[PDB]
């Protein structure tokens with residue numbers, strides 16, 4: 337069966353960090369569900385791009401499990417993810433079943449909020465480092481993409497392609513990732 | 524006054540090539556209007572991301588002129604742009620008033636369809652070269668971004684950041700482009 341990805345989309349999400357992974361994962365033949373944190377309604381992203389989610393998170397979370405749960409960044413988006421009990425439950429379940437969790441920019445700070453993957457090497461946007469490192473529960477990395485087992489993190493809009501291709505490689509292998517990469521006109 | 528950009532959004536547009544320039548231009552303090560070719564309704568992009576335009580093209584075209592007109596790629600999106608009489612009128616007017624026209628991936632093939640900027644050096648997605656070069660009306664480039672006066676072209680999803688920053692540099696200058704670039708985590 338095809339792999340499945342849940343992308344959790346909150347108000348104030350960075351739209352580039354949402355769309356790049358969604359699009360690249362779909363190019364890889366992954367079934368992606370863009371799930372709205374607040375419900376089924378369109379979501380106003382950080383730079384005012386408005387995206388219509390495929391489903392509410394309430395509905396999508398009942399259609400698990402997923403091979404990856406993806407958390408976009410954006411400062412306000414990540415704060416919304418961090419404050420959500422539903423996100424907490426989803427991430428804890430994903431961690432418990434040894435499934436991949438991928439987060440970019442400010443996204444990884446939601447891992448901290450929900451006590452996910454402590455002891456991992458992680459990266460974040462430079463401006464989100466202090467929040468992520470509060471308490472020293474992770475070890476910090478400046479790599480564009482960091483993968484420590486099932487915790488996959490990345491830095492910012494500009495590292496979104498590498499982040500998305502890392503998810504593809506983790507799920508579908510190096511060859512598929514290379515096949516998907518070539519038509520993107522990268523490197 | 525702030526610069527103004529018109530981004531024309533058609534069904535089958537490449538969502539990455541739509542969102543990256545919109546977001547980066549807004550980071551640069553440009554007033555961007557995402558205008559739906561077909562009207563006010565949400566637009567199903569090439570990888571099924573659904574974007575709600577700010578306005579219909581019918582309405583937005585009456586609120587010109589714009590400092591840049593931006594054509595995203597996506598094979599089917601670009602075909603829709605190429606077939607549109609409204610797009611023809613907008614591009615001809617922009618060309619006539621010596622305003623910037625920016626197109627990426629398959630997007631530049633709409634310049635060919637509407638007989639815009641003949642004699643320019645252009646680039647496109649590798650797979651769109653043959654369509655763009657039909658008749659030899661342009662000279663082809665393999666640069667990630669090509670700017671020949673007021674015709675600014677680029678290659679693919681992976682060159683979208685360079686494309687968007689080139690638009691910012693053209694409108695608001697090198698220093699603003701560098702300021703906007705740094706937080707994106709590029710290079």
Ligand SMILES: [Cl-]
Pocket residue numbers: 350382409410411412
């Ligand atoms: Cl942000």
Ligand SMILES: [Cl-]
Pocket residue numbers: 537569596597598599
């Ligand atoms: Cl396409």
